[PDB]
Design a protein around this ligand. Structure first.
Ligand SMILES: [Fe+2]
Length: 54
């Protein structure tokens, strides 16, 4: 699946990894993250992520 970078801090939201410590199972697409999910490192909103693809 896809990876996304937090443009603030460099955390990678890896869709294959999810974010289970914060309620997100492995395999959850970025679009499906709740609107108020934030970067688990720096707290940035979803708007601050960029998908790592051309
Ligand atoms: Fe971040």
């Amino acid at each position: 699946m896809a990876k996304w970078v937090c443009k603030i801090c460099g955390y990678i939201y890896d869709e294959d990894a999810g974010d289970p410590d914060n309620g997100i199972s492995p395999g959850t697409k970025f679009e499906e993250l709740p609107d108020d999910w934030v970067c688990p490192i720096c707290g940035a909103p979803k708007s601050e992520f960029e998908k790592l693809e051309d």
